């Protein structure tokens, strides 16, 4: 066996500065187009016709307020292909209708697939276990849940996050006001996993860095390490005694420590993914019924939950007309919920 | 109550639009990314010390002198995943980065709160974009603003007697 | 604002509620109140807890 | 009957017990509010 396939395989898997691989054929064009689409859109393209928004540097937006915005609600879940029935091959119109959004979302997705396949390919060639790819399954679940599954359960791509900093903040506050998303235990697990992963990252880095063995004369201790050395660079025993006396429990097994470091943020993100999938159907953690029955009968009964629901009601009424222009909302001054004075 | 505190803070300081909180986010998201990453590469490079009918954890014994994974192989992987010089071959440098990134980021988050405490608030691009006539052209910043307004007007619905929330 | 379990909260809604806005930045230890009933009404637990916590 | 050779002993060490009880109790503490609703 020495046909064209194996020869191609040979060239693709050459040890070069930027490895390519079979996975590269999917990854690189798709990642490049995704990123390029985002930069192109953020630099030059409007959201006037889809959102009634400026979204490009060209229009005067800055790095924080620029976006490639979702298509108009009337587009539904159109793939919005350039050659599709909406744009009919017209790039300008395609841009004006938000084609760049679906461009970025879908190429982004095939790109992440390419990246994970890349992780697998390289892991196989180098002879390591493919846990980096497995850990990468979490970002994908998030991306797929938030940018694809979520809007697909709603009316249209319009309500997906728009690819922009400020657009993303808006997406967060929308989720608060409409989904009460903070109340969702799946989100809470997401939070715990993120904050927990950051905690483990910081505490492990600091612990290794503060139980180092003296392996050089330099007061800057970074040079006193050699990649090929057999010995542990820091004292596990000392770390363990330290935390055992400080915190009550401590790692004693390095392999477990590191698997746990994999487990925590990944599991968190995945849980969050499950919650957002729920939100695709408005299947929210919005309320506690018991709370509502009590507050409805008892106007002196107040919790922070009820306060937040008032906040939510404010967000929804005040942001909706401009945020959801396709509904043609007109909310007279007198209906807007407001407390005293403000 | 935590969520309340957060919602009201967004209303009053546009914390999302504040660069220190964004730094906090890069910090905790990044901390998690690197946590999962480090976890995964080290787990990926454990030296075979066990059989398949047992946990790979028993392959490391508490207090052993020899390292339990092959960093050269880990670096070999990750250096090819991105490119060679984007990968750490130094465990001390790598763990220092692991310490510093989330810690510095969270210092900034904390300082974000601590400075918005004295009402130096998030970026305000409300009505920043204007057409030739002078019509306001909304940006995503302005929709954010509408949400903030909702939060502002509804919170502590009985606490205000006067039109401005000055603290 | 009811914060406690016995006064109708669950784990998610529950809180120890912040001290009264009437107090402001005034130091409000148990002994500045005419009674524990008063101390609780004005949210003294918040102050006692957060100060001991921060010190600790 | 002639014994089955695929049998394997099963193990859960104490650290694993503590970890599992922590997981389950904290999950319960989280979700309980929703179960009571």
């Amino acid at each position: 066996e020495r046909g064209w396939f194996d020869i191609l395989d040979d060239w693709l898997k050459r040890d070069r500065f930027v490895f390519v691989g079979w996975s590269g054929i999917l990854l690189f064009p798709c990642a490049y187009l995704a990123l390029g689409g985002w930069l192109t859109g953020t630099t030059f393209v409007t959201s006037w016709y889809t959102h009634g928004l400026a979204s490009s540097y060209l229009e005067g937006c800055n790095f924080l307020t620029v976006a490639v915005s979702t298509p108009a609600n009337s587009m539904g879940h159109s793939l919005l292909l350039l050659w599709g029935p909406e744009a009919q091959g017209d790039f300008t119109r395609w841009c004006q209708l938000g084609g760049l959004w679906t461009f970025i979302a879908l190429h982004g997705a095939f790109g992440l697939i390419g990246f994970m396949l890349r992780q697998f390919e390289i892991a196989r060639l180098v002879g390591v276990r493919p846990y980096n790819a497995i850990a990468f399954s979490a970002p994908i679940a998030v991306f797929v849940s938030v940018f694809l599954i979520y809007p697909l359960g709603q009316s249209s791509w319009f309500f997906a996050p728009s690819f922009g900093v400020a657009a993303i903040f808006r997406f967060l506050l929308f989720f608060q006001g409409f989904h009460n998303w903070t109340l969702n235990p799946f989100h809470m697990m997401g939070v715990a996993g993120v904050l927990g992963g950051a905690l483990l990252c910081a505490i492990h880095g600091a612990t290794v860095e503060n139980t180092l063995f003296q392996d050089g004369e330099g007061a800057s201790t970074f040079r006193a390490f050699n990649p090929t050395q057999a010995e542990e660079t820091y004292s596990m025993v000392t770390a363990n005694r330290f935390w055992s006396q400080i915190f009550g429990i401590a790692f004693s097994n390095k392999r477990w420590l590191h698997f746990f470091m994999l487990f925590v943020p990944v599991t968190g993100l995945w849980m969050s993914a499950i919650g957002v999938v729920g939100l695709a159907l408005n299947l929210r953690s919005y309320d506690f019924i018991s709370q509502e029955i009590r507050a409805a009968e008892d106007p002196e009964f107040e919790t922070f939950y009820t306060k937040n629901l008032l906040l939510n009601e404010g967000i929804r009424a005040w942001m909706a007309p401009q945020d959801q222009p396709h509904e043609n909302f007109v909310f007279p001054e007198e209906v807007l919920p407001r407390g005293n004075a403000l | 109550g935590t969520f309340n505190f957060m919602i009201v803070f967004q209303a009053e300081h546009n914390i999302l639009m504040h660069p220190f909180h964004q730094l906090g986010v890069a910090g905790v998201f990044g901390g998690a990314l690197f946590c999962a990453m480090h976890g995964s590469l080290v787990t990926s490079s454990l030296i075979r010390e066990t059989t398949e009918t047992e946990s790979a954890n028993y392959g490391y014994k508490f207090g052993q002198e020899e390292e339990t994974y092959n960093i050269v192989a880990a670096h070999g992987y990750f250096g090819r995943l991105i490119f060679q010089y984007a990968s750490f071959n130094n465990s001390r440098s790598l763990h220092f980065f692991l310490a510093a990134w989330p810690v510095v980021g969270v210092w900034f988050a904390a300082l974000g709160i601590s400075t918005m405490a004295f009402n130096l608030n998030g970026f305000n691009f409300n009505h920043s974009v204007i057409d030739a006539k002078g019509n306001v052209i909304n940006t995503w910043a302005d929709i954010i603003n509408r949400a903030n307004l909702g939060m502002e007007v509804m919170h502590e619905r009985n606490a205000h007697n006067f039109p401005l929330d000055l603290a | 604002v009811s914060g406690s379990l016995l006064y109708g909260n669950n784990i998610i809604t529950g809180a120890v509620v912040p001290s009264s806005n009437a107090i402001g930045l005034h130091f409000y230890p148990i002994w500045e109140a005419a009674s524990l009933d008063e101390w609780l009404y004005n949210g003294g637990p918040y102050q006692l807890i957060i100060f001991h916590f921060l010190l600790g | 009957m002639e014994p089955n050779p695929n049998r394997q002993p099963v193990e859960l060490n104490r650290t694993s017990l503590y970890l599992g009880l922590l997981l389950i109790l904290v999950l319960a503490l989280l979700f309980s509010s929703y179960f009571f609703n």
Binding site: - | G63, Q64 | N10 | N13, T15, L21, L22, L25, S32, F36
Partner: peptide, 30 residues
């Protein structure tokens, strides 16, 4: 009943802390 449950679960957690700290399997250097 809700309150009883919440407090029960919490108490179970603190007791768990206790056992996890003072009655852990000891780390041994091999």
């Amino acid at each position: 009943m809700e309150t009883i449950t919440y407090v029960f679960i919490f108490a179970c957690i603190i007791a768990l802390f206790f056992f996890a700290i003072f009655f852990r399997e000891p780390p041994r250097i091999t």
